[PDB]
Structure formats: structure tokens, C-alpha cells
Paper text:
Here, we report the identification of human [name] as a dual MTase that targets both the N terminus and [name] of [name] through two distinct MTase domains, firmly establishing its function using a combination of in vitro and in vivo methods. [name] harbors two distinct predicted MTase domains that both belong to the 7BS superfamily. The N-terminal domain (here denoted MT13-N) belongs to a recently discovered enzyme family consisting of likely KMTs15 and the C-terminal domain (here denoted MT13-C) lacks close paralogs, but is distantly related to spermidine synthase (SpdS).
To obtain further insights into its molecular mechanism, we determined the crystal structure of its core MTase domain (residues 470–699) in complex with S-adenosylhomocysteine (AdoHcy), which is a byproduct of the methylation reaction, representing the demethylated form of AdoMet. Moreover, MT13-C and SpdS share a short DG-motif (Asp551-Gly552 in [name]) localized after β-strand 3 and not generally found in other 7BS enzymes. To explore how MT13-C interacts with its peptide substrate, we modeled the 6-mer peptide (GKEKTH) corresponding to the N terminus of [name] onto the MT13-C structure by molecular docking.
Residue numbers in the entry: 470 to 578, 580 to 679, 681 to 693
Write the structure that this text describes.
């Protein structure tokens, strides 16, 4: 919906054939709910997506559920937790631990900190190792970054690249935010023409206007 959300969703083009993308299950972890529009968009446009959303503030979930059309279902669950704690627990799950195709950080907090979007702990290298441990090998880690301190920004970017050696960057028109798209295997990266092709294919489907709501039919039938 908003410009930085459209850019984050665009990162799904780094996964695989965008024809296939709608037609196959996709596991997505999203940290930071806001008004719910980002996970709601994915839920509504990708009928086989399974989303875990982590949100620190129960009031954000309350308002989104009461007034902004957000809801939980079998395919979209919200956990009230600090994303740092939540990812640390998931990463400690053993061979049982989850494996997400996509991890999105849309987290924005404390004015004290040297950056608030995300808080710096989310991009510290020992935490980034926990993120890597719950991502599929060919998955994508997508980060909304606001960092006006350019010295800090270079340190953040260097640390990200140390753990995710394939980095792409999108600056957003009319705002300071940039979206980082982080992957694990630079040798498998798409050539520029392929990069262009996959993006255009994704946007064609998401603009296409459709469907049937199959939820909660049993009450009416019985």
C-alpha cells in the first residue's frame, strides 16, 4: 500500500518463478505489525502464504483487528513478543526449528538509540546469525532501514553483508527509508536481464484485479 511496503513485497521476486510464487506455499515471518497492511496484503494476494507476524505492542494488534480489517487465521498468526526474543527462541528450536522462505523486518521503536528503524540489536552480527539459521538457503531477508548517521549506516551494511553476502538495495522515492534485500549465495544470483524479467512478472500479477472467500462455511451449512 505505502511506498516502502510495495518495495518490500517486490523482494519476493528474488525467490523463484513469479508464476510459481502464487501457486506454491510460502512461509513468511514479519516483525513489526504497524497497521497490519503489509502482512494483510501478502495474506490476501498470496492464497498459499503462511505468515507468522511478531509485534511487541498488544495495542497495535488491538487497533488493527478492531478498525483496520486485520484478522488471524490458520495462515496468519500474530505473536505478541519482542522480535529479538522471538527469533532467539525459534533459532534455539533444534532440528525442529522453523525455516522461513522470507523474513521481513518492518520494525521501528526509544529516541536514545543511534537508530530506531530497526533498533540496532536487530542488525548486530550475533543476532543476524540467528536470523540466518531460520531462513531457507535460497530465501530472502528484507529489511526496512532508516539510518541518517552515515558512519553507523556503513557499519550496519558491512555487518549485514558479512552474514548475507548477496545484498541488493532500493531507495524509496520521497523518503529516507531504504529496503535491503539480503541473500546467502552470491554465486546463484540473477543476471540483470533476469532481475528485470522477474520483477516485471511479479508486478503484472499483483496489479491484476478476483476470487472466492471460502472461510467459515460450516456454520451456515449446519
Amino acid at each position: 500500500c505505502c511506498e516502502h511496503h510495495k518495495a518490500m513485497i517486490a523482494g519476493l521476486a528474488l525467490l523463484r518463478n513469479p508464476e510459481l510464487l502464487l501457486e506454491i506455499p510460502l512461509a513468511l515471518l514479519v516483525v513489526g505489525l504497524g497497521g497490519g497492511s503489509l502482512p494483510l496484503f501478502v495474506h490476501d494476494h498470496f492464497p498459499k502464504s503462511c505468515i507468522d507476524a511478531v509485534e511487541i505492542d498488544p495495542s497495535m494488534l488491538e487497533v488493527a483487528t478492531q478498525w483496520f480489517g486485520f484478522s488471524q487465521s490458520d495462515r496468519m498468526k500474530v505473536h505478541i513478543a519482542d522480535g529479538l526474543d522471538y527469533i532467539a527462541s525459534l533459532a534455539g528450536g533444534g532440528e525442529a526449528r522453523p525455516c522461513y522462505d522470507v523474513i521481513m523486518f518492518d520494525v521501528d521503536s526509544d529516541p536514545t538509540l543511534g537508530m530506531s528503524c530497526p533498533p540496532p540489536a536487530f542488525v548486530e552480527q550475533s543476532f543476524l546469525q540467528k536470523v540466518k539459521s531460520i531462513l531457507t538457503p535460497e530465501g530472502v531477508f528484507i529489511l526496512n532501514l532508516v539510518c541518517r548517521d552515515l558512519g553507523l549506516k556503513d557499519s550496519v551494511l558491512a555487518g549485514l553483508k558479512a552474514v548475507f553476502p548477496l545484498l541488493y538495495v532500493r531507495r524509496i522515492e520521497g523518503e529516507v527509508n531504504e529496503i535491503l534485500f539480503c541473500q546467502l549465495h552470491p554465486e546463484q544470483k540473477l543476471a540483470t536481464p533476469e532481475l528485470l524479467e522477474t520483477a516485471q512478472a511479479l508486478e503484472r500479477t499483483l496489479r491484476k484485479p478476483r476470487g472466492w472467500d471460502d472461510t467459515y462455511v460450516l456454520s451456515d451449512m449446519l
